[PDB]
Design a protein around this ligand. Structure first.
Ligand SMILES: *[C@@H]1O[C@H](CO)[C@@H](O[C@@H]2O[C@H](CO)[C@@H](O[C@@H]3O[C@H](CO)[C@@H](O)[C@H](O)[C@@H]3O)[C@H](O)[C@H]2NC(C)=O)[C@H](O)[C@H]1NC(C)=O
Ligand code: A1JMF
Ligand SMILES: *[C@@H]1O[C@H](CO)[C@@H](O[C@@H]2O[C@H](CO)[C@@H](O)[C@H](O)[C@H]2NC(C)=O)[C@H](O)[C@H]1NC(C)=O
Ligand SMILES: *[C@@H]1O[C@H](CO)[C@@H](O[C@@H]2O[C@H](CO)[C@@H](O)[C@H](O)[C@H]2NC(C)=O)[C@H](O)[C@H]1NC(C)=O
Ligand SMILES: *[C@@H]1O[C@H](CO)[C@@H](O[C@@H]2O[C@H](CO)[C@@H](O)[C@H](O)[C@H]2NC(C)=O)[C@H](O)[C@H]1NC(C)=O
Ligand SMILES: *[C@@H]1O[C@H](CO[C@@H]2O[C@@H](C)[C@@H](O)[C@@H](O)[C@@H]2O)[C@@H](O)[C@H](O)[C@H]1NC(C)=O
Ligand code: NAG
Ligand code: NAG
Length: 742
C-alpha cells in the first residue's frame, strides 16, 4: 500500500477523535512506522494497538479508517472507549485478529455477522461489551473461519445461542468463551472437532450437560457458575486430553463419579452438593494433578492416603465440608510441591504433629481454621529456614498455650490469624520482626500483658484485632509508626490510658473500636485529622471532658477504599439486657464460624440470639466521604453537642447515651438523612426536640429518654412511629406518643 494511503488512513482516524492529544505523535509528513501504538514490518503498517486510551468514538470510525488499512494484520482497541455498533464495511483480507474487548459496543450479537467481510479473520474478542440477543434465535453467527471467539461479559440472554454461534460450522474453532452472559439451553460442540477451550461459565444453563461429542481435542472445560444437575461424567468420559475441569458452583449431587484422569491438571467440583468421601480411584491423577478443589460440599471422612503420590499437587482446597481426623501429615510430607493447603471449616481434630515444620519451607498458605484441632501451636514451626509461608490461619480451634515466638522465623509471613482459641500468655514481641506482616488477629483468647511496643517495627501492618482478651497497660506509642493501619480493635479488654493524639497521623485509619475498656481523658480532637475514619466505637469507658467540635472536619472529604472486601460480623444490641451496652459490635470474621459466636457469652452479657449480621465490607461511598458509625455511650462526656455533629451525611448510627451531655439538641441533627439509629438517652439535654429532625425519614431506632428535654414532639416525621418509652423521664415533654400538650 502507498505510504500516502497509510498516513491519510491513520490521520483521518485521529481527526475524528474528541481528544487529539491521545495520538499526539500521529502527524502527517511522518512515516506511521514511528508512531506510538503502531507496529511495522519492512516499513509497512502491520498492527495498531490503541488500548486503554479513551478514544471516545464509535465503531464506524474504526472500520473506515483502521480496519480498511490494507495490510493491517491485527487491531487492538481493548478498553478504548469505543461505542456504537458493528456494520458492514470493507475489511482488508490481511486482518487476522481484532480485539474490541471492554468497550461499549451495543446492539444484537447478529451485528458481528458482518465481520465475515474479513475473509482472513481468525481471532475475535468482543468480550466485556453490551451486545444482546434479538430474543428468538434467527439464523447464525456465520463466522466459520474463526479459530478464537470470546463473547463473554456481554448482555446476551437467550436459549440455544450457542447453537446459533456454531450453526454454520465450527471446524476451525479451537477456543470458545461465552461466560458472564445469561445464556441457557443446550451446548453442542460435537462438530467442533478441533475445540480445545470451552468456557460457558457464569451463564443460565440449567438443563442438559454440554454434549462434547468425541471430545478428542478438548483440553479446557469450564461449566462452573450455573445451575447444572446432571450426569456430567457420561458427557466427559470420552475426553482423553482434558487438562482442566471446572464444574464448581452448580447444583450437582451425589458422590464423585468416574473421571478421565490421564491428563487432568486442574479439577474443581467446589460449591456443589457432592456427598461421600474422597474416592481412592482419584489416585490415577496424581501423575498430572496440580490443583484440586473440593470445597463447599458435603464430603466426610479424612484425607485418603494415596495423596502422597500426588507429588505435583500445588494446591489442596478441602474446606467447608465435614472432614474429620488428625492432621494426616504422614501424607502431606510427600507433597514436595504443595504451596496452598486449605482444610478450613471441617472437623479435623487432634494436635499439630511435629513434622509440619518441614513443610513450612514449601508452603505459602496454611489454613486449618474452623476445625477442631487442639494442643499447643507448634513452637518449632518455621524452624526449617527459608520459610516461604505467607499466610497462617489457625483461628476457631481448640489450641492452647502461649503464642509461639518462633512464628517470627517465618520472615515472609503476611497474615497471622490465631483468633477464637484458648491461648494464654502475652503477645510475642518478636512479631515486630515480621517486617512484611499486614494482618495480626488474635481476638477471643486469654492473652494477658501489654500490646508490644516492638510493633513499631512493622511498617506494613494494616489491621490489629485483639478484642476479647485480658490485655492491659496503655496504647503503645509505637503504633504511630504503622502508617498503613486501617483497622484497630481493642474491645473487651482492660486497656487503660488515653487515646493518643498521634492517632491523627493515621490518614488510613477507618475503624477504631475501644469499647468495654478503661480508657480515659478528653476525646482527642486529633481524630478529626483521620482521612479514612468511618467507624469510631468508644462505648463503655471513662472518657470525659466535653466533645471536640474539631473531630468532624473530614466530613465530605473522606475516601474509604482500602477497607472494602473483608469478611465481618455486626451484632446488634437489643434493648433488653441493661448489661449489654453500645449500638453494636463490629468484629472481623474472616474464616471463623458464626456458630462459635456463642463463646462470647462468657465475656459479653449481650444475648447474641439471631442478631448477627455479616457479609464482606462494602462501603457505600467511594469519595463522597462521611463517617458512618459513631458510638460513645456509657462514658463521662459532658458539655454541649457541637452543631458540627450534623455534618455527617452517611452516618447510619449515632449513640451518645449514658453521659453528662447538656445543652439543646443542635438543629443540624436533622441533616443526618442516613441516620437509622439515634441514641441520646440518660443525659442532661434540655430544650426542645428540633422540628428539623422531622426531615429524618430513615430513623428505625431512636431514644431521647432520661434527659431535661421540654416541649412538643414534632408531629411530622417518624416521631409518632416510636413508643413512649423512647421519650420518658423528660417531664417538660408532651405530644404523641406522649400525652398532648395541656
Ligand atoms: C434462567 O433460566 C430459568 C429457567 O431455567 C428462568 O426461570 C424462568 O424464567 C421464565 C421467564 O424467562 C419465567 O416465566 C415467567 O413465569 C411466571 C409463572 O411462574 C409468569 O408470571 C410469567 O408469564 C413468565 O412466563 C419462569 O417462571 C421461570 N421459571 C423458573 C424460575 O422455574 C430464569 O428467569 C432465567 N434467568 C435467570 C437470571 O435465572
Ligand atoms: C463498609 C463497612 C465498614 C460496613 C461494616 C458495611 O459492610 C456494612 O454493611 C454496614 C454498613 C451495615 C451492616 C449492618 C449494620 C446495621 C445492622 C443493624 O442492626 C441494622 C438495624 C436497622 O435495620 C437499621 C440499619 C442497621 C443499623 C444496619 C446499618 C448498616 C450496618 C452498619
Ligand atoms: C473455577 O470456577 C470458579 C467459579 O466460577 C472461579 O471462581 C470465580 O472467579 C471469578 C473470577 O475469575 C470471580 O469473579 C468469582 O467470584 C469466583 N467465584 C468464586 C465462588 O470464588 C474460579 O476462578 C475458576 N477456576 C479456574 C481455574 O478456572
Ligand atoms: C460430621 O461427621 C462427623 C463424623 O464424621 C459427625 O460427628 C460424628 O457423628 C457420629 C454420628 O454417628 C458420631 O457417632 C461420632 O461420635 C461423631 N464424631 C465425634 C468425633 O464425636 C458430625 O456430626 C458431622 N457434622 C455435621 C455438621 O453434620
Ligand atoms: C530463626 O530461628 C533461629 C533459631 O531460633 C534464629 O537463630 C538465632 O538468631 C538470633 C537473632 O538474634 C541470633 O542472635 C542467634 O545467634 C541465632 N542462633 C544461634 C544458635 O546463634 C534465627 O535468627 C531466626 N531467624 C529469623 C527470626 O529470621
Ligand atoms: C477528666 O478526668 C481527669 C482524670 O481524673 C481521673 O480520671 C477520671 C475519669 C476520674 O475517675 C477522676 O476521679 C480521676 O482522678 C481529670 O484530671 C479531669 O479534670 C477530668 N475532667 C476534665 C474536664 O478534664
Ligand atoms: C451511539 C453513540 O455514539 N452514543 C454515545 C454518544 O451519544 C455520546 O455523545 C458519547 C459520549 O462519550 O458516547 C457515545
Ligand atoms: C435471650 O435469647 C433467647 C433466645 O431464645 C430469647 O428467647 C430470650 O428472650 C433472650 N433474653 C433476653 C433477656 O434478651
Amino acid at each position: 500500500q502507498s505510504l500516502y494511503r497509510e498516513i491519510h488512513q491513520l490521520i483521518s482516524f485521529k481527526d475524528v477523535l474528541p481528544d487529539k492529544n491521545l495520538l499526539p505523535d500521529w502527524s502527517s509528513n511522518k512515516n506511521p512506522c514511528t508512531f506510538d501504538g503502531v507496529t511495522c514490518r519492512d516499513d509497512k503498517v502491520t498492527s495498531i494497538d490503541l488500548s486503554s486510551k479513551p478514544l471516545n468514538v464509535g465503531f464506524s470510525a474504526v472500520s473506515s479508517s483502521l480496519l480498511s488499512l490494507t495490510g493491517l494484520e491485527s487491531l487492538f482497541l481493548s478498553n478504548s472507549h469505543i461505542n456504537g455498533s458493528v456494520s458492514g464495511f470493507k475489511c482488508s483480507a490481511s486482518l487476522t485478529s481484532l480485539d474490541l474487548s471492554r468497550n461499549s459496543l451495543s446492539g444484537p450479537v447478529t451485528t458481528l455477522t458482518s465481520l465475515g467481510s474479513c475473509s482472513g479473520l481468525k481471532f475475535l474478542n468482543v468480550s466485556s461489551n453490551t451486545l444482546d440477543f434479538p430474543g428468538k434465535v434467527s439464523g447464525g453467527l456465520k463466522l466459520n473461519s474463526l479459530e478464537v471467539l470470546d463473547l463473554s461479559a456481554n448482555s446476551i440472554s437467550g436459549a440455544n445461542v450457542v447453537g446459533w454461534v456454531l450453526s454454520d460450522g465450527c471446524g476451525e474453532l479451537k477456543h470458545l468463551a461465552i461466560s458472564g452472559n445469561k445464556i441457557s439451553g443446550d451446548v453442542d460442540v460435537s462438530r467442533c472437532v478441533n475445540l480445545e477451550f470451552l468456557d460457558v461459565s457464569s451463564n443460565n444453563f440449567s438443563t442438559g450437560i454440554p454434549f462434547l461429542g468425541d471430545c478428542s481435542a478438548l483440553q479446557h472445560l469450564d461449566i462452573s457458575g450455573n445451575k447444572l444437575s446432571g450426569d456430567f461424567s457420561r458427557a466427559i468420559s470420552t475426553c482423553t486430553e482434558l487438562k482442566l475441569l471446572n464444574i464448581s458452583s452448580n447444583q450437582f449431587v451425589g458422590p464423585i463419579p468416574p473421571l478421565p484422569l490421564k491428563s487432568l491438571q486442574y479439577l474443581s467440583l467446589a460449591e456443589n452438593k457432592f456427598t461421600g468421601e474422597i474416592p481412592d480411584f482419584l489416585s490415577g491423577a496424581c501423575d498430572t494433578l496440580t490443583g484440586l478443589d473440593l470445597s463447599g460440599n458435603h464430603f466426610y471422612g479424612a484425607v485418603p492416603p494415596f495423596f502422597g503420590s500426588c507429588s505435583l499437587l500445588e494446591s489442596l482446597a478441602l474446606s467447608s465440608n465435614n472432614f474429620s481426623g488428625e492432621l494426616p501429615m504422614d501424607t502431606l510430607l510427600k507433597m514436595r510441591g504443595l504451596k496452598v493447603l486449605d482444610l478450613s471449616f471441617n472437623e479435623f481434630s487432634g494436635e499439630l504433629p511435629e513434622s509440619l515444620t518441614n513443610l513450612s519451607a514449601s508452603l505459602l498458605t496454611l489454613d486449618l481454621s474452623s476445625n477442631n484441632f487442639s494442643g499447643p501451636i507448634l513452637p518449632n514451626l518455621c524452624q526449617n529456614p527459608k520459610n516461604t509461608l505467607q499466610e497462617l490461619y489457625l483461628q476457631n480451634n481448640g489450641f492452647t498455650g502461649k503464642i509461639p515466638p518462633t512464628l517470627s522465623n517465618c520472615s515472609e509471613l503476611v497474615s497471622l490469624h490465631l483468633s477464637f482459641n484458648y491461648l494464654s500468655g502475652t503477645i510475642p514481641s518478636s512479631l515486630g520482626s515480621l517486617s512484611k506482616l499486614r494482618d495480626l488477629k488474635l481476638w477471643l483468647n486469654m492473652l494477658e500483658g501489654e500490646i508490644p511496643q516492638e510493633l513499631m517495627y512493622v511498617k506494613t501492618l494494616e489491621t490489629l484485632i485483639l478484642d476479647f482478651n485480658d490485655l492491659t497497660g496503655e496504647i503503645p506509642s509505637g503504633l504511630s509508626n504503622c502508617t498503613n493501619l486501617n483497622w484497630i480493635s481493642l474491645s473487651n479488654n482492660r486497656l487503660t490510658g488515653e487515646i493518643p493524639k498521634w492517632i491523627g497521623r493515621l490518614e488510613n485509619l477507618a475503624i477504631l473500636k475501644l469499647s468495654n475498656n478503661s480508657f480515659s481523658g478528653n476525646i482527642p480532637a486529633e481524630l478529626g485529622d483521620c482521612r479514612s475514619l468511618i467507624w469510631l466505637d468508644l462505648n463503655t469507658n471513662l472518657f470525659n471532658g466535653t466533645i471536640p467540635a474539631a473531630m468532624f472536619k473530614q466530613s465530605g472529604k473522606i475516601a474509604a477504599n482500602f477497607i472494602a472486601g473483608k469478611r465481618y460480623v455486626y451484632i446488634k444490641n437489643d434493648g433488653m439486657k441493661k448489661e449489654c451496652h453500645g449500638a453494636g459490635n463490629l468484629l472481623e470474621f474472616q474464616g471463623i464460624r458464626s456458630e462459635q459466636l456463642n463463646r462470647l457469652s462468657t465475656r459479653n452479657p449481650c444475648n447474641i440470639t439471631s442478631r448477627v449480621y455479616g457479609g464482606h465490607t462494602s462501603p457505600t461511598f467511594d469519595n463522597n466521604g462521611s463517617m458512618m458509625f459513631l458510638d460513645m455511650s456509657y462514658n463521662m462526656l459532658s458539655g454541649y453537642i457541637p452543631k458540627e455533629i450534623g455534618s455527617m451525611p452517611y452516618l447510619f448510627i449515632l449513640n451518645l447515651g449514658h453521659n453528662d451531655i447538656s445543652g439543646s439538641i443542635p438543629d443540624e441533627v436533622g441533616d443526618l438523612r442516613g441516620l437509622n439509629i439515634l441514641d441520646l438517652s440518660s443525659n442532661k439535654l434540655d430544650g426542645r426536640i428540633p422540628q428539623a429532625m422531622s426531615a429524618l425519614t430513615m430513623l428505625t431506632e431512636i431514644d431521647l429518654s432520661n434527659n431535661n428535654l421540654s416541649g412538643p414532639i414534632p408531629e411530622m416525621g417518624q416521631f409518632e412511629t416510636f413508643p413512649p418509652a423512647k421519650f420518658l423521664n423528660n417531664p417538660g415533654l408532651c405530644g404523641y406518643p406522649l400525652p398532648r400538650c395541656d
